């Protein structure tokens, strides 16, 4: 029925998100200007770098995350980073015109802008479909932050060491989510809600997979890799 601890976990994650997601998008002004070949890469690279920083800050506040080894923490962030960014970006995504609207026209990204970052439809289409499907769930902010935390602490991540501990931490987050839906999400919106959210995590592994291929191809050419940031290169691989 949602113990005090489970409510505690949610309150912690909500605050962690509030401290790492600025809906005013004021910081975007510090990024290299968006330009509409690969004219949007400098801007989106900066956007992503900033986002990596915010996802890291969010992750450190995940109850239990701090108990993992420095190595495990590193492994989880490198593997989930792109996934959590895609996930958190749903907050700026708008089905009005299938674009990521971050406060203004300059900061409103659509399919062509992503295309101008070096990506193809093989990633973009399923990415928009994902955003569309996630939006369709109309998740409570509570469910949104729990999903990002669950995504981060995944036991099957490649290179994971203490998988047992990682699984234990995630399980506590999963049980928190499952119970929240049952007790706080009214039907019909709660119908199969948990399974649907886990399915989104499966979609993200696929998206992660495709993004990594296009990123390696894109970052294989020095001139492109030259337009990224130091953090992006370190986290997404060099």
């Amino acid at each position: 029925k949602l113990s005090e601890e489970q409510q505690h976990i949610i309150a912690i994650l909500l605050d962690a998100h509030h401290k790492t997601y600025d809906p005013t998008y004021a910081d975007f002004r510090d990024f290299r200007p968006p330009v509409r070949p690969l004219s949007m890469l400098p801007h989106l690279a900066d956007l992503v770098s900033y986002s990596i920083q915010k996802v890291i800050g969010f992750a450190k506040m995940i109850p239990g995350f701090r108990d993992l080894t420095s190595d495990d923490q590193i492994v989880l962030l490198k593997s989930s980073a792109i996934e959590v960014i895609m996930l958190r970006s749903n907050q700026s995504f708008t089905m009005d015109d299938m674009s990521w609207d971050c406060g203004s026209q300059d900061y409103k990204y659509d399919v062509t802008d992503v295309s101008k970052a070096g990506h193809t439809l093989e990633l973009i289409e399923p990415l928009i479909k994902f955003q569309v499907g996630l939006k369709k769930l109309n998740l409570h902010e509570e469910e949104h932050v729990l999903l990002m935390a669950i995504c981060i602490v995944s036991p099957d991540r490649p290179g994971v060491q203490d998988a047992k501990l990682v699984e234990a931490i995630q399980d506590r987050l999963s049980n928190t989510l499952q119970t929240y839906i049952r007790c706080r999400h009214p039907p019909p919106g709660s119908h199969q809600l948990y399974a649907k959210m886990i399915q989104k995590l499966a979609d993200l592994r696929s998206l992660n997979e495709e993004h990594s291929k296009q990123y390696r191809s894109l970052s294989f050419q020095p001139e492109n890799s030259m337009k990224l940031t130091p953090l992006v290169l370190e986290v997404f691989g060099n």
């Binding site: 920083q53 890291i56 800050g57 420095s70 190595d71 590193i74 962030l77 490198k78 370190e234 986290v235």
Partner: peptide, 11 residues
């Protein structure tokens, strides 16, 4: 395994 910036942000 040698992720300076990422490690610093996690400390």
């Amino acid at each position: 395994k040698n992720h300076p910036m990422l490690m610093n942000l996690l400390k």
